[PDB]
Design a protein around this nucleic acid. Structure first.
Lengths: 268, 314
DNA sequence: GGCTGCGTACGTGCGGGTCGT
DNA sequence: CACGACCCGCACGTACGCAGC
C-alpha cells in the first residue's frame, strides 16, 4: 500500500479523535485544534495513580458480578467479616453471618466439600447456601488463601450468584420408549417402568394406529421440523384419552446422524 | 512578493507545530499515569487515553468500608471490561496483563473488534446492543502469553476463550456493557486443586465416552466399562438436551465451553446434578480436532433414587 | 492583489522493529 | 546480540488551497 494512503489514514484518524475530544469537553460544546487541546488540558485539571479509585472499582465489580465478599478463618470456618451486600443476595442480615461459621450457612451435603476446600493460594468451588426471610441457591466462590491480619490464614472470597398435562419422552426410529418422565404417572397413569421397551403403537386405538405410524415415518424424514398428531391413547384405567404428540428428530451437532426422536405428549 | 509569502508561510507553521507538540505533552501528564510512562506516549495514544478517561468519569458520575476495598480486585478470577455500544473499550482492570499479557494502556480506548476473532464479531455486536439487561457468552480475544508464562509480540498472538458475564446499563442514550471476563483453564494445565466431588472423562467429537475416571463408580454407580462407546446424549435428562446441544455447538466452534447445570441419570435410578467444563484437544500436525476432554463437578447426591427413567437403569 | 491564520497532501529521515545465512 | 538486511511508524518540513478584515 502506498505511503501517502497510510499517512492520509493516520490524518483522518487523528481528526476523528480531535472531534470526539471536542465533543467530550463541556466548555467546547467550533474552535481550532490548538484551542481544543488547551481547553481539554485546562478541564482535566478540575478533575483528578490509577484510572479508577478503589471505591469506584468496588462499585463496578458489584454491578458486574451481583455478589458479596466474605472472609472465613481456616481453622474453624468462623466468619471474620462480610460485606453489606450479603443482605441483597441471600436476604440474610450481616448479624446472622458475624460470629457464626461458614458451615452453618451451607447445605448439609456440602459440608465435606467445604471442609476439604478450606483445609491448608487460589480457591474455587461451587456450594449451596441458605436463604433467609430451607431454600437454597447455587453460588460460585472465587478467592485466595493468605495470611491475616494484614495458624493465621483466612480465605478471602467473593460469592457470585450463578444463574401437568404434558410429559417428555424419547424414542428410537421404531417407536420403543427409551426415556419417560415421571409426569407420566399422573398424566396417563402408567408407571415409567410400564412403558419402557414397548412400542408406542401398542397403546394406540386400533383405528388410529396407521396415522401414528405415518407420523413416525414422516418425522424421521423431515429431519428437524416438528410434527403434531392427535390420537387416542389407552390409559392404565382402560380409558381412551385424546393426546397430542409434538415430535422432531435430534441430530448430533457434529455428525448430524439421528440420536433419538423426542416427543412432548400432552393430554387434551 | 511570492517569495516573501513563502518565507512567511514556512515560519508560521513551525511555531504552530511547536505549540501543538507542547500542548500535547501538557495533556499527557494530566492523565492518571506515572510520569515516566506518560512522557513517552505518542500523540494518538494520548488522545485515546484522554477520551477514554473522560468517558469513564462521565459514567461513574452517573453511577456514584474503605480499607477492605482493595481486596476486591485480587479476590477475582478474571478481569473487568467496559465496552460502549460502538465497541470502544473505555476501561480495563489492571490485572489484565496477567491473563492475556496485554497491558491496560495498550488496550484502553481501542475498538474491541480489532482484538477478537472475526467469526465472533456478530455475536459481540448482538450482545452489546439493547435488542434482559443480563448477558452471558463466549468470545475469543488475542492473548500474547505462552503456556510457559512468557510474553510474545502481538503478531505471534494466539486466541484465548473468555467466559463473559455481566450486564448492560443505560445512563441518562449511552449503553455501556459491563462484563467480567473469566478465562477457562485448560484441563492439562490446572493449578486449582480439585475437590472430592470431581471425576475426569474424555470423549470423541460426537460426545461418545472413550474414557471415564474410576470415581464415577462411587459418585454415580456406573462402571467405567459400561460407558465406553455409548453416546453421552443418552444419559442426559431429556429436559437438559437443549442446553447440552447448545454447549456442544459452542465447544466445537470455539474450542472451550462451561456447561450449565444438568442431570445425569444414575445407575440404580434417579439422577445427580452436574456441571462440566469442556476443552478440545487439537492435533498439531494438521490442526484437526481429536478428542474432547472434560472435568465434571458433582453438585448433589442421587435424588429420587426410587425412580426408573431410562431402559439402562432396569 | 498584499499578508495572515488554518487545514490538508507528499516526501524524507530516523530508531526500533525482523529476518537470515 | 551481533549488523546490514531492510520494512514499518512516526513525526516534521514545505507547500497548496481558502476566508477575511
Amino acid at each position: 500500500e502506498n505511503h501517502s494512503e497510510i499517512e492520509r489514514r493516520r490524518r483522518n484518524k487523528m481528526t476523528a479523535y480531535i472531534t470526539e475530544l471536542s465533543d467530550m469537553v463541556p466548555t467546547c460544546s467550533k474552535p481550532d485544534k490548538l484551542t481544543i487541546l488547551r481547553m481539554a488540558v485546562s478541564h482535566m485539571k478540575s478533575l483528578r495513580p490509577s484510572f479508577l479509585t478503589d471505591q469506584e472499582l468496588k462499585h463496578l465489580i458489584l454491578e458486574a458480578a451481583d455478589g458479596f465478599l466474605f472472609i472465613v478463618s481456616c481453622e474453624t470456618g468462623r466468619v471474620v467479616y462480610v460485606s453489606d451486600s450479603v443482605t441483597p443476595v441471600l436476604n440474610q442480615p450481616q448479624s446472622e453471618w458475624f460470629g457464626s461459621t461458614l458451615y452453618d450457612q451451607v447445605h448439609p451435603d456440602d459440608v465435606d466439600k467445604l471442609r476439604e476446600q478450606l483445609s491448608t493460594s487460589r480457591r474455587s468451588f461451587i456450594c449451596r447456601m441458605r436463604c433467609g426471610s430451607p431454600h437454597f441457591v447455587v453460588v460460585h466462590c472465587t478467592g485466595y488463601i493468605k495470611a491475616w491480619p494484614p495458624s493465621k490464614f483466612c480465605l478471602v472470597a467473593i460469592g457470585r450468584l450463578q444463574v401437568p398435562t404434558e410429559f417428555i419422552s424419547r424414542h428410537n426410529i421404531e417407536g420403543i420408549f427409551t426415556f419417560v418422565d415421571h409426569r407420566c404417572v399422573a398424566t396417563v397413569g402408567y408407571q415409567p417402568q410400564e412403558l419402557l421397551g414397548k412400542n408406542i403403537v401398542e397403546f394406540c386405538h386400533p383405528e388410529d394406529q396407521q396415522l401414528l405410524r405415518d407420523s413416525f415415518q414422516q418425522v424421521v424424514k423431515l429431519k428437524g421440523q416438528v410434527l403434531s398428531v392427535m390420537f387416542r391413547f389407552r390409559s392404565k384405567n382402560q380409558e381412551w384419552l385424546w393426546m397430542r404428540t409434538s415430535s422432531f428428530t435430534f441430530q448430533n451437532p457434529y455428525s448430524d446422524e439421528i440420536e433419538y426422536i423426542i416427543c412432548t405428549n400432552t393430554n387434551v | 512578493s511570492s517569495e516573501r509569502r513563502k518565507e512567511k508561510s514556512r515560519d508560521a507553521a513551525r511555531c504552530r507545530r511547536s505549540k501543538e507538540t507542547e500542548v500535547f505533552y501538557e495533556l499527557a501528564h494530566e492523565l492518571p499515569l506515572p510520569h515516566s510512562v506518560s512522557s513517552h506516549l505518542d500523540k494518538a495514544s494520548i488522545m485515546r487515553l484522554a477520551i477514554s478517561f473522560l468517558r469513564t468519569h462521565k459514567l461513574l458520575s452517573s453511577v456514584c468500608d474503605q480499607q477492605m476495598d482493595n481486596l476486591y480486585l485480587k479476590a477475582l478470577e478474571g478481569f473487568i471490561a467496559v465496552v460502549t455500544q460502538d465497541g470502544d473499550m473505555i476501561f480495563l482492570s489492571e490485572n489484565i496483563s496477567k491473563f492475556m499479557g496485554l497491558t491496560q494502556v495498550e488496550l484502553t480506548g481501542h475498538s474491541i473488534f480489532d482484538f477478537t476473532h472475526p467469526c465472533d464479531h456478530e455475536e459481540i455486536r448482538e450482545n452489546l446492543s439493547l435488542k434482559s439487561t443480563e448477558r452471558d457468552f463466549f468470545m475469543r480475544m488475542k492473548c500474547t502469553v505462552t503456556n510457559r508464562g512468557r510474553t510474545v509480540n502481538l503478531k505471534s498472538a494466539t486466541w484465548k476463550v473468555l467466559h463473559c458475564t455481566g450486564q448492560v446499563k443505560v445512563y441518562n442514550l449511552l449503553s455501556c456493557l459491563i462484563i467480567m471476563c473469566e478465562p477457562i483453564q485448560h484441563p492439562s494445565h490446572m493449578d486449582i486443586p480439585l475437590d472430592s466431588k470431581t471425576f475426569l472423562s474424555r470423549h470423541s467429537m460426537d460426545m461418545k465416552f472413550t474414557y471415564c475416571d474410576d470415581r464415577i463408580t462411587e459418585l454415580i454407580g456406573y462402571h467405567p466399562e459400561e460407558l465406553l462407546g455409548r453416546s453421552a446424549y443418552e444419559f442426559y435428562h431429556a429436559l437438559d438436551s437443549e442446553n447440552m446441544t447448545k454447549s456442544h455447538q459452542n465447544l466445537c466452534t470455539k474450542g472451550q465451553v462451561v456447561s450449565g447445570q444438568y442431570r445425569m441419570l444414575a445407575k440404580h435410578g434417579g439422577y445427580v446434578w452436574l456441571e462440566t467444563q469442556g476443552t478440545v484437544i487439537y492435533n498439531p500436525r494438521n490442526l484437526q480436532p481429536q478428542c474432547i476432554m472434560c472435568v465434571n463437578y458433582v453438585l448433589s447426591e442421587i435424588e429420587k433414587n426410587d425412580v426408573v427413567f431410562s431402559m439402562d437403569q432396569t
